[model samples]
Target: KVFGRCELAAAMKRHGLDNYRGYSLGNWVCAAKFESNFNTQATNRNTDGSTDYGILQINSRWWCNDGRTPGSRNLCNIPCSALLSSDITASVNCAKKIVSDGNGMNAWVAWRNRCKGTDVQAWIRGCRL
Candidate 1:
């Protein structure tokens, strides 16, 4: 789980995400918890019959470029190994970028709540970062 700044940058760009360096560690951890249960192997079924995969649960069905050809691997086009790379901070930061973009943390928190419901704004306000 060792992460340096350079790896974090790569992870963010690879995920088609932005922002997060200014966020608190708590905010980062919360977003990651919601996106993938902190499990780099997480996957979500997509309407197009494809899948979103990995720690940030990247929707490879849409985001996959030449690097991840169709059906190239299980759990969507994304390799679990890539998401599970030693630099977890980068993975978490990727999620933060998406959340901060306005969809907000509530979406992920609700996912973590199993759709029971939660306040995304409140979570953002109380976030340590």
Candidate 2:
């Protein structure tokens, strides 16, 4: 698990996610909180037979291959298991690619549901970024 919000933010910043693809760092952090609470091992199976993986809860339908699911687009080209690691490099890169695809943080439903139109600044409070 990550140390705290500040640590998560610092890692994200070090990986060039502070304001990636024009989306604010707060949006990403807020989405992370609602999606996985910063737990890299987080996973949730959706009713649609797809699963959300890792901190951002990226969907297995198009983002990564879970090996059990058929017709997975696997756009990230990495095993979904890789997302479950605390390293976060592959997950962060995949997320960056998703954002660069023009989906922005909208790729994450948690962002739309919890972070959108909300006071997201608190996600980065005292992060020193």
Candidate 3:
């Protein structure tokens, strides 16, 4: 399922991600925008063989167990496939773990490459979230 930008932003806010662990709601919005464009089913395999899953693209190596990732930590304790569900609960919870795990939002390369240190209010400007 694909969410409209405002829709995703509002959802994240309601999930209590606003200023979560000191990261602004806009930072989360920017990461989600660049990671999956609000598409719930997004996935990608990296050159290193680990896969990223769901709207926030949580990594298979450390978060979700994809079975094939070496030493899959399964820190989120759910199958990687769970992130592909139209329901965002699994993905959102896993994302919470990532930030709380001491990695912060830089867990996503998209966050570093496209979102870091930038004013992303424009990303959710009209969301009113």
Candidate 4:
């Protein structure tokens, strides 16, 4: 399912910091596509009563690390599922944070440039290091 380019573009513009540097949305979309095909309604069962939810497969309980109870943390409060609902921008931002903290978009720039010619997205996925 191809997310409309217009929608993705808008989302990228909003979550992304700048055209060239804030391309994390592009990477995230690629990641989401490869991971769950953009399934906002998706969820993975966790062994410790927690779960990974939404498009980015964000393990909120684990990633939050806020010391709050599961599902009650700010990590759970953000509208991450917006990617699936109706707001692509929010989804992109949420996905970025899940990946790069606040520097998500720019963090992958160098890596992307090296791989953009061949398969930047694949590089990000295969070699997240």
lDDT of each: 0.47, 0.86, 0.87, 0.47
Winner on lDDT (1 vs 3): 3
* Models ranked on lDDT: 3, 2, 4, 1
Score candidate 4 by TM-score against the native.
0.51
lDDT for each residue of candidate 3 in 1-129, tens digit (9 for 90 to 100)? 998888888888888888888988888889988998888889998888999988999888899888899877998999999998887888888898999977788788899889988997777788775
RMSD of 3: 1.2
Q: Give the TM-score of candidate 3.
A: 0.93
* lDDT digits (tens) for residues 1-129 of candidate 4: 344433443454455623333453345545455444566665565576655555555654634332333654445346334434544544555555554566543333433444244453442342322
lDDT of 1 at 60: 50
lDDT of 2 by residue, 5-49 (tens): 888887788888877887788888898899999998999999889
- Alpha carbon lDDT at 88, candidate 2: 79
TM for every model, in the order presented, reads 0.42, 0.93, 0.93, 0.51
**Candidate 3 residue runs with Cα over 4 Å from true position:** none
Q: Is candidate 1 or candidate 2 better by TM-score?
A: 2
lDDT of 2: 0.86
What are the runs in model 2 whose C-alpha is more than 4 Å off? none
TM-score attained by model 1: 0.42
How well does candidate 3 score on lDDT at residue 33?
Answer: 85
**Each candidate's root-mean-square deviation in Å?**
7.9, 1.2, 1.2, 7.8
